[PDB]
Design a protein around this ligand. Structure first.
Ligand code: NI
Ligand code: NI
Ligand code: NI
Ligand code: NI
Ligand code: NI
Ligand code: NI
Lengths: 118, 118, 118
């Protein structure tokens, strides 16, 4: 019930970097709104570091979606103007993935971790 | 009835700089059209340098609106593509302000300058 | 009925350069589609290097249209964002010209070249 923060730490970095691009709304409004929804769920996943193992496919895909947001945010300053639509579509799909992840059943997650299955 | 040009000089500079960005129409069409409407009014304000004092709040705001146009024009080459909407809104409001100023009653201006009031 | 390739060589260069800008569709979809339609016609014009002389006004304008595509493609990386509409219109007209050229009557061309006229 207490945890050292890693998912939530890596997510707060991505939020603080995205917020800087106020003029570009798919990042600073849409994506940070989704990421701020997802942020408490990352906090309580990190608090459950004992009951969960972060290797399962759901948490590995959480890692990978937050890392796609990270990579996209860090490359934004070099997105050329004629890549706008392209990049926006990419940002939107990151957004959608994060939202679907926010429907994760944590109790079933730690359940499947405490007891073996087929 | 004869004046050394200062409002109109600072406005002609801003016009000649804005005109250069032919591809970007909010500057080179819309803003220079408004500024070319306002330009003769600046000429006759400068010709009246005796009857008016340029310290009153209307002429200080004329100074400040022409200076917002100046600053915006000089920063345009470094407006990034995802700031377009933002910058355009700013340019539009400069435009609107200039137009409203072109309804200034000069006779009431020099009147309030020749005789004291409460 | 066999020819060393020059129109078609200069056109293949322009195609391979335009294709690189995948994100920008007026170039990499629209213009290369038109140019790939025009490409076999350039091949068979080059194969007919004996029966035709490339000096006539139709083939000189083929030269000049392919060279406008070349110049436009090579300058694209320095098209600023607020020139988009402008440049796109230019690209579109190159496109239209190429398409109309693809209605050239080659038989009448080599005919007017084999026999003198007024
Ligand atoms: Ni937060
Ligand atoms: Ni990262
Ligand atoms: Ni003028
Ligand atoms: Ni200034
Ligand atoms: Ni080809
Ligand atoms: Ni060339």
């Amino acid at each position: 019930s207490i945890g050292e923060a890693v998912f939530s730490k890596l997510l707060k970095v991505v939020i603080d970097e995205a917020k800087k691009f106020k003029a570009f709304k798919p990042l600073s409004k849409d994506l940070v709104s989704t990421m701020e929804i997802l942020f408490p769920l990352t906090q309580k996943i990190d608090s459950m570091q004992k009951e969960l193992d972060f290797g399962v496919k759901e948490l590995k895909e959480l890692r990978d979606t937050i890392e796609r947001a990270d990579v996209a945010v860090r490359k934004f300053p070099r997105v050329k103007w004629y890549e706008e639509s392209e990049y926006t579509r990419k940002i939107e799909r990151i957004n959608k993935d994060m939202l679907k992840f926010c429907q994760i059943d944590l109790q079933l997650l730690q359940h499947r971790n405490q007891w073996s299955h087929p």
